[PDB]
Amino acid sequence: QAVEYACEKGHRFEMPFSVEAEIPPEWECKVCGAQALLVDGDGPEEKK
């Protein structure tokens, strides 16, 4: 149960969210510096 974000740097990272939340389709890249697109955001974090 973790959300997965992928930055335009090419890196993917997971962050803790609510599994009953509407996971934001994009988030700031905590890894390197970019806008990271949320992947598999069906609803639950690790729904996929």
Swiss-Prot record:
<feature type="binding site">
    <location>
        <position position="32"/>
    </location>
    <ligand>
        <name>Zn(2+)</name>
    </ligand>
</feature>
<feature type="binding site">
    <location>
        <position position="7"/>
    </location>
    <ligand>
        <name>Zn(2+)</name>
    </ligand>
</feature>
<comment type="function">
    <text>Binds to RNA polymerase (RNAP), stimulating transcription from principal, but not alternative sigma factor promoters. Stimulates transcription from several principal sigma factor HrdB (SigA)-dependent promoters but not from a SigR-dependent promoter. Stimulation occurs in the presence of the transcription initiation inhibitor rifampicin (Rif).</text>
</comment>
<comment type="subunit">
    <text>Homodimer. Forms a complex with the RNAP, and a complex with RNAP plus principal sigma factor HrdB associated with promoter. Binds to free principal sigma factors HrdB and HrdA, probably via the sigma-2 domain, but not to 6 other sigma factors tested.</text>
</comment>
<protein>
    <recommendedName>
        <fullName>RNA polymerase-binding protein RbpA</fullName>
    </recommendedName>
</protein>
<feature type="binding site">
    <location>
        <position position="11"/>
    </location>
    <ligand>
        <name>Zn(2+)</name>
    </ligand>
</feature>
<feature type="binding site">
    <location>
        <position position="29"/>
    </location>
    <ligand>
        <name>Zn(2+)</name>
    </ligand>
</feature>
<comment type="similarity">
    <text>Belongs to the RNA polymerase-binding protein RbpA family.</text>
</comment>
